[PDB]
Amino acid sequence: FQSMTVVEIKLFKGPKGLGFSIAGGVGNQHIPGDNSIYVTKIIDGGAAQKDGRLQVGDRLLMVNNYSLEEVTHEEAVAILKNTSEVVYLKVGKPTTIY
């Protein structure tokens, strides 16, 4: 009934960044039993919102070749901070099977 669809999303940073926040990581789980990195908020007017594709609850899988599989929150954050203007996100979207 539930699955994941993997999508590639390219964002261009605005002056206020990509326009989203994250939670999760090994030792700082967003969801019980699950170490993945999740999008927790999408800022109105921000790059991610305007682009239209990223959604709250989506899993961040990779950023510019850097894996976010089984990373700490701090490793994730450093990856997100390390970015310049153009950012390629590999995203896992929760999906319902009909």
Swiss-Prot record:
Notes on the domains: An N-terminally truncated L27 domain is predicted in isoform 2 at positions 1 through 27.
Family statement: Belongs to the MAGUK family.
Assembly description: Interacts through its PDZ domains with NETO1. Interacts with NOS1/nNOS through second PDZ domain. Interacts with KCNJ2/Kir2.1 (via C-terminus) through one of its PDZ domains. Interacts with KCNJ4, Interacts with FRMPD4 (via C-terminus). Interacts with LRFN1, LRFN2 and LRFN4. Interacts with FASLG. Interacts with KCNJ4. Interacts with ADAM22. Interacts with DGKI (via PDZ-binding motif).
PTM characteristics: Palmitoylation of isoform 1 is not required for targeting to postsynaptic density.
Subcellular location: Cell membrane; Postsynaptic density; Synapse; Membrane
PDZ domain ranges (all copies): 8-94
Function in brief: Required for perception of chronic pain through NMDA receptor signaling. Regulates surface expression of NMDA receptors in dorsal horn neurons of the spinal cord. Interacts with the cytoplasmic tail of NMDA receptor subunits as well as inward rectifying potassium channels. Involved in regulation of synaptic stability at cholinergic synapses. Part of the postsynaptic protein scaffold of excitatory synapses.
Disulfide-bonded cysteines: none
Protein name per its UniProtKB record: Disks large homolog 2
